[PDB]
Write a protein that binds this DNA or RNA. Sequence first.
RNA 1: UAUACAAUUAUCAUAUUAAAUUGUUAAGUGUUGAUUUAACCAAUAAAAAUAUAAAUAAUUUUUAUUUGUUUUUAAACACCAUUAGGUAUAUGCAAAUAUAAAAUUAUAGUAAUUAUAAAUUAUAUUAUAUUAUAUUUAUUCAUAUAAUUAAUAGGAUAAUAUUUGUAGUUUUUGAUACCAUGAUAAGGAUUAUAAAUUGAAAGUGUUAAUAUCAUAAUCAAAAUUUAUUAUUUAUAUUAAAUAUGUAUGUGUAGAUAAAAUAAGAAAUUAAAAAGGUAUUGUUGCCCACCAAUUUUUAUAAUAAAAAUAACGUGCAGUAAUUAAUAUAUUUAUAAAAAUAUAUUUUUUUUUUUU
Lengths: 161, 141, 142, 6, 283, 48, 46, 53, 58, 74
Amino acid sequence: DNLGVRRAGRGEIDSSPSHSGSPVFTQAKLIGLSGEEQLTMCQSETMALRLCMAKAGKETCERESRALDSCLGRVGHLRRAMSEACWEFNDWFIQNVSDNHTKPFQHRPHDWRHFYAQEKLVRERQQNGHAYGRRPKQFSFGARYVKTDGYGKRPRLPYNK
Amino acid sequence: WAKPKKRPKVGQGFHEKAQKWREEYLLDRHRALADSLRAYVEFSTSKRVEPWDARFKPFDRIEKDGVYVLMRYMMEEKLQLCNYHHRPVKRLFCNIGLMGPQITTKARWKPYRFATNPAGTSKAERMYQRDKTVYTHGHND
Amino acid sequence: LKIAKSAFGFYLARRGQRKYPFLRRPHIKNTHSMNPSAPYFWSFMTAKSQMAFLPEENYITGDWTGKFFVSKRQVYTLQHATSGAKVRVKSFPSIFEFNSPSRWNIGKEMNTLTKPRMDLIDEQMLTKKQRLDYVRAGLLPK
Amino acid sequence: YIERXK
Amino acid sequence: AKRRVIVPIHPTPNFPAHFIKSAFTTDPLKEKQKARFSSGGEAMREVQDIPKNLEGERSRRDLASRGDTEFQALVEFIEGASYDQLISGRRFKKVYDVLSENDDMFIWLCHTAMSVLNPGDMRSRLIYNHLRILAESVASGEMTQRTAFRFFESAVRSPAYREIAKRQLEGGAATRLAGISAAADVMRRMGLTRRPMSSYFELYQRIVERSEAMTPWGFPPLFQFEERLSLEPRLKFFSRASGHVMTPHTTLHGRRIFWIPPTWNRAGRFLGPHVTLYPGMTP
Amino acid sequence: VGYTPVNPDTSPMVAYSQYHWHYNLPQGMERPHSVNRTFAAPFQSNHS
Amino acid sequence: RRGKPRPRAGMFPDKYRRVPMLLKPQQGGQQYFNHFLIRSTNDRLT
Amino acid sequence: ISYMEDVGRSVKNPTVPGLMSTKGMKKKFHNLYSSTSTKRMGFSNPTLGIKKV
Amino acid sequence: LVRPDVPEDQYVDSWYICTSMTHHMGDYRPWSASAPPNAFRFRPFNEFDAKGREYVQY
Amino acid sequence: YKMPKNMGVAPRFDTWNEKYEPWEHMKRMGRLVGTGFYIPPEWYNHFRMFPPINHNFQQEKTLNPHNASEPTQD
RNA sequence: UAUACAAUUAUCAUAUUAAAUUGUUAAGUGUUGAUUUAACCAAUAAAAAUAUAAAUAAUUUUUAUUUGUUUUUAAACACCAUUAGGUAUAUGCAAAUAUAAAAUUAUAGUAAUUAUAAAUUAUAUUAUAUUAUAUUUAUUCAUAUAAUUAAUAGGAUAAUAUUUGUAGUUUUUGAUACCAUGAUAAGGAUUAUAAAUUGAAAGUGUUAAUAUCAUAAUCAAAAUUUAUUAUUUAUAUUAAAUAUGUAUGUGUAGAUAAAAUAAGAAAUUAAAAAGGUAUUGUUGCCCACCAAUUUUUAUAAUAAAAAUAACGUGCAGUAAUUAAUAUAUUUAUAAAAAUAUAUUUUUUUUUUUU
Ligand SMILES: [Mg+2]
Ligand SMILES: [Mg+2]
Ligand SMILES: [Mg+2]
Ligand SMILES: [Mg+2]
Ligand SMILES: [Mg+2]
Ligand SMILES: [Mg+2]
Ligand SMILES: [Mg+2]
Ligand SMILES: [Mg+2]
Ligand SMILES: [Mg+2]
Ligand SMILES: [Mg+2]
Ligand SMILES: [Mg+2]
Ligand SMILES: [Mg+2]
Ligand SMILES: [Mg+2]
């Protein structure tokens, strides 16, 4: 039954939705659950409590620890919410955006070769329609200042060799 | 399941070698046996250390009082007759009856291999210093 | 079996190192039959009573042409020493012989006077591999 | 890896 | 290479021809493959889905006495609560398939109601007859949903249509009531459902569920309708469907309905599904 | 299958097959047998 | 098991899988409920 | 949480470092146990096993 | 449920198959036919359970 | 050489519409019925006299986004 | 033997309407020394930033002009060789993919083709769809022997059988010590808790069609070399089938074993993206040198090219054990390798002023 849907179930091999042909494997990384850059709920809390803990041992603060674990207690349902919404996104995306791995990759430079060609063409017509894909010869670190008069001190256009 | 590989031939002159080896193994075993029987009976006759543990009671008590009194005046001849081997010592203490029920329950005796040491033994190393060429089952001095 | 030391090596499987019910192993090989005991000398590997008669094999049961070896359970009798006759027992490789009579033998079985596992090891019956392994055990010199 | 063909 | 030589077996009083060719193969690279499946009368009549033909008197008699199949399916599912039977997922499947026999027809109609900005006035007999005819052609398979939809929007309405639409609509989105009352009306006057309400209810329900979806009334052109590649049945648009270490070796070990129950050759230690090994005490 | 034929009395796979009586059928006697009543054989011992 | 890593704990069926939910934990002290109810109502009136 | 009490905190790191040195021990990952490849057909993908350095 | 829910005296564990069968093939009697008419928790008698019957008797 | 996964079954992104376009079925069914040897489906009995709109063309053959292709969906 | 390219879009060598060319900046000394590298060895180390407008379109430049090779190291990096040095980047020469073409190879007579891209190929740290691997206890592991497998035959209390005592050698050959097909084991890796099992098909001596060396079988009392086995560790110790004499050494090397189930353990992780010159597919295929031969010729250390199935060296290629491809220069048992450029017919990892 998994033919004609060339994407298979979910959490499953070949379930991944595609965007301009390269599949989407970063979903969690988006909603900021489980990422190195991940969204952080409570900071001021833990820094406040750490501050207290480091200051002195005479007075003890459960006054902070309560604020903090109140915070975490909420954080749980917040996360289940975000995860839920994101699964909804995976579905919406699959319906209305993804091409199901049908269209050519856009994400590697050679896939844009035509574009680059357009600019090579330009640099050639500037050269009297001649040197295609040619570039100025690299010179030396000290190129300008080590060369005597009569020799080119700066790299020329390639047709101007 | 591999087909079993056939066993190689016996050897030559091995039948005489084996006959000889077993033969003189037995003629040796005769002096082994003789020596060990001497050692065993010699052990049986000679004196041993006291089989009871003086770290528990009714034994820890001063040798001028309690059990030892019962031992000095009433039991002495009997204990010296059996050379303090732990089996008849314990049995005599059973039969004297003035300790009566305690011999097994309350009282405590040295482990088998320690109680076997010769009279006048000083250091524990004496357990491993007994002759090893003799077959008495740890029953030799 | 790996090596066939007999007929049965063809028929039998070893089945690893396998446990048998107490005191029943299919092939009785008494490695312990000669196992020196001074104090236990009369009670060990011998008649459970001193009041029993000698076994069947201490007597000629019928008209015999004659025998090669007497069975190993035949007890050594004073006549075994005195008479000066061939006393043969089937051991390995071939046969053991009571040649040099002594009175220290009397009243024990030749099951007891014959060492089943000898310390003498022929290298002619061993594979090169086997010899290697016995060298591992620190039995054979090399 | 080199020998893999045997 | 010591190739295995299999002797062919000839048909026998108890070993008939087709049995031989099905259960025995002389090419021993084909041994130990897997199990093969076949069907006889009823499972074949289900699988092959050969639509019957109308015929002489018996077939018409059987059309007459037919009665309500939708209720029959339900009775037969329900009857699994009788003491002498079980509750069958197959009986339920047959139930389901008769409830949803039309299904996609409704789906099509949703699109005509909700997927089209300004489909004229849907009360007027003209556009109404367009809708009616196309619907009856989506049912009875005479047309593809795609073709019927593209027909519906390209159907002839009225001269200078857009310029008349500028006299009513700003951004060209009409009101959707006329459309739904129409699309329920068609299914009622066409005989589409056995029980009258079902038309209206399904059409309404399917809309109300989609109302909550992001960009609800637009659809990708390829997935909207029948096309080579499709969406998985949960994501289709107006659709009705919107130990642990030892478990692979366990398999059979739960409470398991079987097809062919295992046999002693093919399963070594399994005791049967009914068995309760750690029984509790009950009065 | 083998050189030793299955003895059909002991073997369930014979007994309970379609060509004999399975254990879930009702286990009664199939037909009566009068052998010794129909034709009777007079006694002649092989020993005098 | 054999020359392989032991599974993670959650890869096994539940340790207490055969012990009914009412048992873990036991709810005991049912005797005191009524007492603490009457107590709290009397309190309220005060 | 059973047994709550008001007692003061202790000093940070009251424990004296153990007699087994964890530092001089090298952490092993991939070759640690022995695995069996589920690879059905074809050359095993070189990027995973061998490719970097 | 794997098999119809009925008193297990109607079931026999099959030989060679892992499954059970009815020793009267295909027929079934409901629990109501095992006990006397209108038996509370179908029972030989309504007074007590098994253990209760036994120790009362004792 | 690596490709996007489903390219084998990738649809023709220009022409996949043609097959389903109403005019097509109008013409085909037109010369099918004409034979005398086919029974016209009823949709054809209907759109026979209300043939579909002329100048709506897809965005595939006409490459313009700004073209408002539809009198309806505009 | 003769017998009908394209002209709307075709990648290796016959270019052509074009604005360039020229710019004098930077960087350098305090002191007693393990920098760089997966790893060696020579031995001061810092550094070289600026330009737009403008040049008109086409019709006789094709012997003209033009497509990354460049003086000066007394300046370095870098690269090549290894402590000695070489070299260290557009003033000589140097047309050349950006496509005008007619099946592959081949200097334009050789072989009969070649080339090609989407099927298929298990591991690249994703959210707890709803709960835990970092705990416990273990590791001295041995046992087989003394040859004949070939058919029936009934008894006391029964109407009579010496059938008491039933007598016809000799033409066949496989399960054997021996080649002689089948078939059932072991092996935990994601269908979960409710009225419920923590053991699987992919085959472990004995089993049914290949015959053409031989009697090898326990009924006692017996000979250690075999990967695949939980033994009793200090108060008392051999009586019935005969029953194990050796190893006290700081609970001590390496390396190993078992378990989440009527027992008692609790928070760290795991699902989703991927290539094949093979084609039941890596035990897959291929690459060059290195012999014979065969055949055409435009004979360069040792001619060139094409067929080809030995021998020997390797392991060049299939993202393939330092990714490949093209040009360039160098290097060389042989595939090829080093460096300089371009490049993906190589696999991807992603800051819209922080
Ligand atoms: Mg590739
Ligand atoms: Mg693919
Ligand atoms: Mg050209
Ligand atoms: Mg087999
Ligand atoms: Mg020639
Ligand atoms: Mg040549
Ligand atoms: Mg290479
Ligand atoms: Mg290679
Ligand atoms: Mg390579
Ligand atoms: Mg190359
Ligand atoms: Mg080159
Ligand atoms: Mg080379
Ligand atoms: Mg090269």
